Amino acid sequence: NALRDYAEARGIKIGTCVNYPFYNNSDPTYNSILQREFSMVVCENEMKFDALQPRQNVFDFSKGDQLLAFAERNGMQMRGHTLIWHNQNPSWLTNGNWNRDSLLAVMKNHITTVMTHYKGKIVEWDVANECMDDSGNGLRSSIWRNVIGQDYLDYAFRYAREADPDALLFYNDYNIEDLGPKSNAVFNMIKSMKERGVPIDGVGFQCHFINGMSPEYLASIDQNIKRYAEIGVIVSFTEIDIRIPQSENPATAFQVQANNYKELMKICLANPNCNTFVMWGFTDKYTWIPGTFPGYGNPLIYDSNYNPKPAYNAIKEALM
Hints:
Keywords: Carbohydrate metabolism, Disulfide bond, Glycosidase, Hydrolase, Polysaccharide degradation, Signal, Xylan degradation. One of its GO terms (biological process) is xylan catabolic process. One of its GO terms (molecular function) is endo-1,4-beta-xylanase activity. The protein has 14 helices and ten strands. It is α/β, with parallel strands linked by helices. It has a single domain, classed as TIM Barrel, CATH 3.20.20.80. It has an eight-stranded parallel barrel, surrounded by six helices. Helix 7 runs parallel beside helix 9 and helix 12 runs parallel beside helix 14.
Protein backbone atom coordinates (compact mmCIF):
# COMPACT_ATOMS: atom_id res chain seq x y z
CA ASN A 1 0.00 0.00 0.00
CA ALA A 2 2.99 2.47 -0.12
CA LEU A 3 3.41 5.06 -2.87
CA ARG A 4 6.32 3.03 -4.33
CA ASP A 5 4.08 -0.06 -4.70
CA TYR A 6 1.47 1.70 -6.81
CA ALA A 7 4.17 3.52 -8.74
CA GLU A 8 6.09 0.30 -9.44
CA ALA A 9 2.84 -1.25 -10.75
CA ARG A 10 2.67 1.55 -13.29
CA GLY A 11 6.36 1.48 -14.33
CA ILE A 12 7.17 4.86 -12.64
CA LYS A 13 9.94 5.54 -10.06
CA ILE A 14 8.80 7.89 -7.26
CA GLY A 15 11.44 9.63 -5.21
CA THR A 16 12.70 12.48 -3.07
CA CYS A 17 15.91 14.33 -2.24
CA VAL A 18 17.32 13.26 1.14
CA ASN A 19 17.60 16.06 3.72
CA TYR A 20 20.39 16.37 6.26
CA PRO A 21 18.81 14.62 9.30
CA PHE A 22 19.15 11.32 7.44
CA TYR A 23 22.92 11.29 7.92
CA ASN A 24 23.18 11.98 11.65
CA ASN A 25 20.00 10.03 12.59
CA SER A 26 18.45 12.98 14.41
CA ASP A 27 14.96 12.26 13.02
CA PRO A 28 13.90 8.54 13.21
CA THR A 29 10.42 9.26 11.83
CA TYR A 30 12.02 10.90 8.75
CA ASN A 31 14.09 7.76 8.07
CA SER A 32 11.17 5.38 8.63
CA ILE A 33 8.92 7.11 6.06
CA LEU A 34 11.87 7.50 3.62
CA GLN A 35 12.70 3.74 3.51
CA ARG A 36 8.99 2.78 3.21
CA GLU A 37 7.39 5.05 0.59
CA PHE A 38 10.00 5.79 -2.08
CA SER A 39 11.72 3.84 -4.84
CA MET A 40 14.32 6.55 -5.72
CA VAL A 41 16.59 8.96 -3.75
CA VAL A 42 18.82 11.95 -4.70
CA CYS A 43 21.42 13.84 -2.61
CA GLU A 44 20.23 17.33 -1.75
CA ASN A 45 23.71 18.83 -1.34
CA GLU A 46 26.21 16.03 -0.79
CA MET A 47 27.13 15.37 -4.43
CA LYS A 48 27.62 18.99 -5.50
CA PHE A 49 31.20 20.05 -6.59
CA ASP A 50 32.21 21.69 -3.29
CA ALA A 51 31.16 18.62 -1.29
CA LEU A 52 32.80 16.03 -3.53
CA GLN A 53 36.12 17.81 -4.30
CA PRO A 54 36.70 20.21 -1.34
CA ARG A 55 40.43 20.62 -2.08
CA GLN A 56 42.10 20.17 -5.45
CA ASN A 57 42.36 16.43 -6.21
CA VAL A 58 40.93 15.39 -2.86
CA PHE A 59 37.56 13.54 -3.22
CA ASP A 60 35.18 12.96 -0.38
CA PHE A 61 32.77 10.09 -1.14
CA SER A 62 31.66 9.47 2.44
CA LYS A 63 28.07 10.83 2.34
CA GLY A 64 27.29 9.69 -1.17
CA ASP A 65 28.47 6.12 -0.40
CA GLN A 66 26.41 6.11 2.80
CA LEU A 67 23.25 7.04 0.81
CA LEU A 68 23.98 4.48 -1.92
CA ALA A 69 24.36 1.68 0.66
CA PHE A 70 20.95 2.63 2.17
CA ALA A 71 19.38 2.72 -1.35
CA GLU A 72 20.68 -0.72 -2.18
CA ARG A 73 19.37 -2.47 0.94
CA ASN A 74 16.00 -0.81 0.34
CA GLY A 75 15.65 -1.65 -3.35
CA MET A 76 15.90 1.98 -4.42
CA GLN A 77 17.54 3.62 -7.44
CA MET A 78 19.56 6.84 -7.14
CA ARG A 79 19.97 9.96 -9.30
CA GLY A 80 23.33 11.80 -9.29
CA HIS A 81 23.07 15.52 -8.67
CA THR A 82 25.01 17.38 -10.01
CA LEU A 83 28.34 17.78 -11.83
CA ILE A 84 28.54 21.15 -13.60
CA TRP A 85 26.76 24.17 -12.05
CA HIS A 86 27.51 27.91 -11.50
CA ASN A 87 26.75 27.65 -7.77
CA GLN A 88 28.35 25.83 -4.89
CA ASN A 89 31.86 25.62 -6.34
CA PRO A 90 34.88 25.33 -3.93
CA SER A 91 37.10 28.37 -3.37
CA TRP A 92 40.16 26.70 -4.96
CA LEU A 93 38.20 26.59 -8.25
CA THR A 94 36.50 29.99 -8.27
CA ASN A 95 39.71 31.77 -7.17
CA GLY A 96 42.11 29.80 -9.37
CA ASN A 97 43.99 31.04 -12.46
CA TRP A 98 42.50 29.17 -15.41
CA ASN A 99 42.44 29.20 -19.17
CA ARG A 100 40.32 27.10 -21.54
CA ASP A 101 42.76 24.18 -21.59
CA SER A 102 43.46 23.97 -17.86
CA LEU A 103 39.77 24.30 -16.87
CA LEU A 104 38.73 21.57 -19.35
CA ALA A 105 41.28 19.30 -17.63
CA VAL A 106 39.76 20.05 -14.20
CA MET A 107 36.26 19.38 -15.62
CA LYS A 108 37.36 16.04 -17.09
CA ASN A 109 39.09 14.90 -13.89
CA HIS A 110 36.05 15.77 -11.73
CA ILE A 111 33.51 14.11 -14.00
CA THR A 112 35.60 10.95 -14.62
CA THR A 113 36.66 10.40 -10.99
CA VAL A 114 33.13 10.84 -9.57
CA MET A 115 31.27 8.85 -12.24
CA THR A 116 33.70 5.88 -12.28
CA HIS A 117 33.38 5.60 -8.45
CA TYR A 118 29.60 5.10 -9.00
CA LYS A 119 29.83 3.34 -12.37
CA GLY A 120 26.73 1.30 -13.13
CA LYS A 121 25.14 2.19 -9.78
CA ILE A 122 23.45 5.57 -10.57
CA VAL A 123 20.75 5.48 -13.28
CA GLU A 124 20.30 9.15 -14.11
CA TRP A 125 22.92 11.90 -13.81
CA ASP A 126 22.27 15.66 -13.84
CA VAL A 127 25.47 16.41 -15.79
CA ALA A 128 24.74 20.12 -16.08
CA ASN A 129 22.34 22.21 -13.97
CA GLU A 130 20.70 25.63 -14.57
CA CYS A 131 23.05 26.78 -17.32
CA MET A 132 20.48 28.71 -19.39
CA ASP A 133 19.90 32.37 -18.69
CA ASP A 134 16.41 33.15 -17.36
CA SER A 135 15.64 35.28 -20.41
CA GLY A 136 16.19 32.24 -22.64
CA ASN A 137 18.65 34.36 -24.64
CA GLY A 138 21.65 32.13 -24.16
CA LEU A 139 23.89 30.48 -21.63
CA ARG A 140 24.40 32.04 -18.22
CA SER A 141 27.79 33.57 -17.41
CA SER A 142 29.74 31.29 -15.01
CA ILE A 143 33.35 30.21 -14.44
CA TRP A 144 32.85 27.32 -16.96
CA ARG A 145 31.15 29.44 -19.60
CA ASN A 146 33.41 32.47 -19.36
CA VAL A 147 36.74 30.62 -19.31
CA ILE A 148 36.08 27.68 -21.65
CA GLY A 149 33.71 29.30 -24.11
CA GLN A 150 30.40 28.62 -25.80
CA ASP A 151 30.96 24.87 -26.34
CA TYR A 152 31.73 23.92 -22.73
CA LEU A 153 28.57 21.75 -22.38
CA ASP A 154 29.51 19.60 -25.38
CA TYR A 155 32.66 18.57 -23.46
CA ALA A 156 30.82 17.91 -20.19
CA PHE A 157 28.43 15.47 -21.89
CA ARG A 158 31.22 13.73 -23.90
CA TYR A 159 33.36 13.26 -20.75
CA ALA A 160 30.34 11.88 -18.88
CA ARG A 161 29.44 9.38 -21.60
CA GLU A 162 33.03 8.08 -21.62
CA ALA A 163 33.06 7.72 -17.80
CA ASP A 164 29.91 5.61 -17.55
CA PRO A 165 28.38 4.55 -20.89
CA ASP A 166 25.36 3.02 -19.11
CA ALA A 167 24.25 6.18 -17.26
CA LEU A 168 21.40 8.29 -18.70
CA LEU A 169 22.75 11.83 -19.01
CA PHE A 170 20.49 14.80 -18.20
CA TYR A 171 20.48 18.60 -18.56
CA ASN A 172 18.42 19.88 -15.54
CA ASP A 173 16.81 23.33 -15.18
CA TYR A 174 13.80 25.33 -13.87
CA ASN A 175 11.14 27.33 -15.81
CA ILE A 176 11.62 25.09 -18.89
CA GLU A 177 8.43 22.98 -18.42
CA ASP A 178 5.98 25.07 -20.50
CA LEU A 179 6.28 26.49 -24.04
CA GLY A 180 7.73 29.87 -23.03
CA PRO A 181 11.03 31.50 -24.19
CA LYS A 182 13.38 29.74 -21.74
CA SER A 183 11.72 26.37 -22.50
CA ASN A 184 12.11 26.98 -26.23
CA ALA A 185 15.80 27.97 -25.77
CA VAL A 186 16.52 24.70 -23.87
CA PHE A 187 14.63 22.51 -26.38
CA ASN A 188 16.50 24.03 -29.35
CA MET A 189 19.81 23.70 -27.45
CA ILE A 190 19.23 19.99 -26.80
CA LYS A 191 17.93 19.32 -30.30
CA SER A 192 21.07 21.00 -31.77
CA MET A 193 23.45 19.10 -29.43
CA LYS A 194 21.96 15.82 -30.63
CA GLU A 195 22.23 16.86 -34.28
CA ARG A 196 25.95 17.43 -33.69
CA GLY A 197 26.51 14.03 -32.09
CA VAL A 198 26.76 15.20 -28.46
CA PRO A 199 25.55 12.41 -26.10
CA ILE A 200 22.54 13.68 -24.16
CA ASP A 201 19.68 11.37 -23.16
CA GLY A 202 17.24 13.41 -21.09
CA VAL A 203 15.95 16.73 -19.83
CA GLY A 204 15.18 17.31 -16.17
CA PHE A 205 12.16 19.52 -15.42
CA GLN A 206 12.75 20.82 -11.84
CA CYS A 207 9.04 21.61 -11.39
CA HIS A 208 9.35 24.36 -8.73
CA PHE A 209 5.73 25.49 -9.15
CA ILE A 210 3.35 27.86 -7.38
CA ASN A 211 0.05 26.52 -5.95
CA GLY A 212 -2.95 26.97 -8.24
CA MET A 213 -1.66 25.82 -11.62
CA SER A 214 -4.19 26.37 -14.42
CA PRO A 215 -5.38 23.64 -16.85
CA GLU A 216 -3.84 25.59 -19.73
CA TYR A 217 -0.46 25.67 -17.96
CA LEU A 218 -0.66 21.94 -17.29
CA ALA A 219 -1.67 21.38 -20.91
CA SER A 220 1.48 23.24 -22.12
CA ILE A 221 3.75 20.96 -20.01
CA ASP A 222 2.17 17.88 -21.67
CA GLN A 223 2.75 19.31 -25.18
CA ASN A 224 6.36 20.18 -24.25
CA ILE A 225 6.93 16.53 -23.16
CA LYS A 226 5.59 15.35 -26.54
CA ARG A 227 8.01 17.53 -28.54
CA TYR A 228 10.94 16.04 -26.54
CA ALA A 229 9.65 12.53 -27.45
CA GLU A 230 9.77 13.55 -31.13
CA ILE A 231 13.52 14.19 -30.84
CA GLY A 232 14.03 11.00 -28.79
CA VAL A 233 14.66 12.63 -25.41
CA ILE A 234 13.29 11.33 -22.12
CA VAL A 235 11.92 13.67 -19.45
CA SER A 236 12.26 13.40 -15.67
CA PHE A 237 10.41 15.56 -13.09
CA THR A 238 13.36 16.15 -10.74
CA GLU A 239 12.69 18.59 -7.91
CA ILE A 240 8.91 18.93 -7.63
CA ASP A 241 7.47 21.23 -5.00
CA ILE A 242 4.26 23.33 -5.03
CA ARG A 243 4.62 26.43 -2.90
CA ILE A 244 1.77 28.14 -1.05
CA PRO A 245 1.55 31.90 -0.16
CA GLN A 246 1.79 32.29 3.67
CA SER A 247 -1.42 34.33 3.60
CA GLU A 248 -3.69 31.79 1.75
CA ASN A 249 -6.04 29.80 4.09
CA PRO A 250 -4.16 26.46 4.75
CA ALA A 251 -7.14 24.10 4.72
CA THR A 252 -8.41 25.04 1.26
CA ALA A 253 -4.91 25.86 -0.16
CA PHE A 254 -4.00 22.19 0.67
CA GLN A 255 -6.91 20.94 -1.46
CA VAL A 256 -5.78 22.97 -4.49
CA GLN A 257 -2.18 21.71 -3.94
CA ALA A 258 -3.49 18.11 -3.86
CA ASN A 259 -5.21 18.56 -7.23
CA ASN A 260 -2.09 20.14 -8.75
CA TYR A 261 0.01 17.16 -7.56
CA LYS A 262 -2.62 14.77 -8.95
CA GLU A 263 -2.63 16.45 -12.38
CA LEU A 264 1.20 16.38 -12.56
CA MET A 265 1.16 12.61 -11.88
CA LYS A 266 -1.47 12.11 -14.61
CA ILE A 267 0.81 13.87 -17.09
CA CYS A 268 3.66 11.55 -16.05
CA LEU A 269 1.41 8.47 -16.52
CA ALA A 270 0.23 9.59 -19.98
CA ASN A 271 3.65 10.07 -21.56
CA PRO A 272 5.80 6.98 -22.34
CA ASN A 273 9.09 9.04 -22.28
CA CYS A 274 8.49 10.45 -18.74
CA ASN A 275 8.79 7.85 -15.93
CA THR A 276 10.65 9.52 -13.05
CA PHE A 277 8.68 11.61 -10.51
CA VAL A 278 10.97 13.08 -7.82
CA MET A 279 9.85 15.67 -5.25
CA TRP A 280 12.27 18.01 -3.47
CA GLY A 281 11.58 16.53 -0.07
CA PHE A 282 8.50 14.93 1.50
CA THR A 283 7.77 16.79 4.76
CA ASP A 284 7.08 20.50 5.09
CA LYS A 285 9.48 20.34 8.10
CA TYR A 286 12.54 20.39 5.77
CA THR A 287 12.41 22.58 2.66
CA TRP A 288 14.50 25.22 0.88
CA ILE A 289 11.34 27.10 -0.19
CA PRO A 290 11.04 29.78 2.57
CA GLY A 291 14.66 30.84 2.12
CA THR A 292 14.40 31.41 -1.58
CA PHE A 293 10.83 32.57 -1.85
CA PRO A 294 10.13 34.44 1.42
CA GLY A 295 6.39 34.53 2.01
CA TYR A 296 5.84 30.95 0.62
CA GLY A 297 5.94 27.55 2.31
CA ASN A 298 4.22 24.18 3.00
CA PRO A 299 5.21 22.73 -0.41
CA LEU A 300 5.27 18.99 0.26
CA ILE A 301 3.10 15.88 0.87
CA TYR A 302 3.49 15.42 4.63
CA ASP A 303 3.07 18.24 7.10
CA SER A 304 5.66 19.16 9.75
CA ASN A 305 4.26 16.55 12.15
CA TYR A 306 4.43 13.79 9.56
CA ASN A 307 0.68 13.68 8.99
CA PRO A 308 0.00 12.99 5.33
CA LYS A 309 -1.59 16.03 3.62
CA PRO A 310 -4.38 15.76 0.97
CA ALA A 311 -1.63 15.64 -1.69
CA TYR A 312 -0.42 12.21 -0.53
CA ASN A 313 -3.79 10.57 -1.13
CA ALA A 314 -4.27 12.49 -4.35
CA ILE A 315 -1.03 11.06 -5.80
CA LYS A 316 -2.05 7.55 -4.61
CA GLU A 317 -5.43 7.99 -6.40
CA ALA A 318 -3.83 9.04 -9.72
CA LEU A 319 -1.62 5.88 -9.51
CA MET A 320 -4.72 3.69 -9.00
